[model samples]
Target: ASGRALFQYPMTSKIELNGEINGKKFKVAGEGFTPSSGRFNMHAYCTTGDLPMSWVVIASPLFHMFAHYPEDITHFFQECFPGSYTLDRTLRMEGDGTLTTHHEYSLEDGCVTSKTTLNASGFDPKGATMTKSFVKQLPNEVKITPHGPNGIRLTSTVLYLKEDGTIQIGTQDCIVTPVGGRKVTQPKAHFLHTQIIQKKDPNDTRDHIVQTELAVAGNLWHGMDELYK
Candidate 1:
């Protein structure tokens, strides 16, 4: 089975994220999956940098108006925004070897839908894990990866109807390579930079330029160690 995953290997990860909101710079770092007794662990810390600005940013009406994945996952993974975001959707594993994910998130103008489908079966475990995570992503391409009978690698795109009412699509390249002969899959897209190419909207706020840079390093395949262990 090509879809059989192979990430039964230990992993180590480190990701540095720094970006800005309306010219205010926010920088943070996350490092984890250090070897624990029999599992991997992680930790995140916020340094002293414009602490008051966070209150302003958090209280804004356009918090996630320009949100995107990768960093979106980072925010959720690290619980950066506390309870401001949520995942309330349904996943229907189709019978034709395809997986469908449907979800939504709040936005400034309105609620945006993230509906995507991906190949759910027939993966190669011997090769790098491949998976697509366009579930929260509005994509011309789309959700969830490859690791072990159990490694998966994934390639998905991010597409959406932007603020200007035009169709925009973005590219996301991801890889998951198992290490130390462990089943934990690792994120392999630290070098992929974010791309923004949208027309300006005269109707939206001028102070909502949000940018996020995300990276992940560690031995937990999809943060599954806690669940599967």
Candidate 2:
């Protein structure tokens, strides 16, 4: 007798996060997943930019797990990218500490761009003066050529990492081809390419529960909305 084999894919899990900041209670739900490397990855997409700035906090234990690697992955990112910024390791305790990271990238003329600050201490008692240690600027441009698995060609300008272990990336351009033809304009929607990571797990299933919100803002182009309608 021959037996049939079954392939199983993991099911995604969603986690709810609720908290209050500045006396305001805001609720958010995110998904979490553990990658093969044992790193946890969580992701949430919000349509409204007004959502209290989200964060990805990494514990020191997890940091130590990857200690064999010389540079802090986060710090390496800050340095490899373009922009001037600072990374504060003061709060980063020897063990069991947490590092929070956020990202915001935009697009212009078919290019993607972003700005970031590292270890920024806005609510600390030491005040803003003690927070900034280094700064830099970064910008990248990407080109895509289709081949097997959809060829991707990318070229980036020099990325400058600051002494404080912060990387700042400037504007970047990308070409993507799906079933449709080339896309010349930026997607009309907001929050085009934004993500948050919790523990560095890329395959974790809990990475998709976050909601992606959509809203229209700013002055409308002259009769552009009417023309579309």
Candidate 3:
């Protein structure tokens, strides 16, 4: 009989990009956990003293446009919006296991869009709702939680994972957040440095695998510059 690890493949992700909208710099960020990747980022200087709403959209998952392709009112969805192939972003939210999300709408569109800020300035109102199964999940399942500032604690406890290295009873994860500061009042810039993938223990043994890719979901984050020339 043949004995080999089953279900060995790739899926899902998260990413961010830096750009200017309304003549203001911003880091358009997103997190979907799907195979589809995107680029987006935002900043804070774009807002006005009149409506705090002007500054709200400065840092959000919305407006992920990809100008590398020369697109989107000069504002692409991949760079401006949280482009999740599936709006179901629960898997990327805080939870113990696989979760489902229902993205609610501030409900503004068509020539007139509502201001994209929290109900209360600086307060993140629940725009997207997520659901999780009480049922026990497989060992390979990922668990996440809210961390310092707006960071997320991600973990994957599986038998053994390669690419990075052996992860028996693996406790490896990524600490990611969208543009952080000592406080929320901080202005523009891409998410916190505060991220990436690495083995839990550098001393851990290695696994049998040529390459490894940490697929967080549909969220994609790029470098200091856009993919455009």
Model 3 TM = 0.21
Highest lDDT, which number?
1
Residue 17 alpha-carbon offset, candidate 2, angstroms:
0.7
* lDDT of every predicted structure (CA atoms): 0.26, 0.25, 0.24
lDDT of 2 by residue, 71-164 (tens): 2111111122232112112222112222232223322232223222223223322321122222322222222122124222222232334456
- Selected candidate, larger TM-score, 2 vs 3: 2
Single out the weakest 10-residue window by summed lDDT for candidate 3.
1-10
Return the number of clashes found in candidate 2.
25
Candidate 3 lDDT over residue span 1-229, tens digit each: 1001111112222333343322333332333222222222211121221222222111122321111222111111122222111121222223212222222222112111112222211221222111111111123333334445433444444342322443223133444333212222111122221111222233423211111122222212333124211
TM-score of 1: 0.25
lDDT per residue for candidate 1 within 103-214, as digits (tens), equals 2222212222222112223322221111211112231222233323423333444443323444334333332232224333332322222222212235533322222222
Candidate 3 residue runs with Cα over 4 Å from true position: 1-139, 161-167, 180-229
Would you estimate the TM-scores of all the predictions? Answer: 0.25, 0.24, 0.21
TM-score ranking, best first: 1, 2, 3
Worst 10 residues of 1 by lDDT: 56-65
Error of 2 at 82 (Å): 47
**lDDT at 52 for candidate 2?**
40
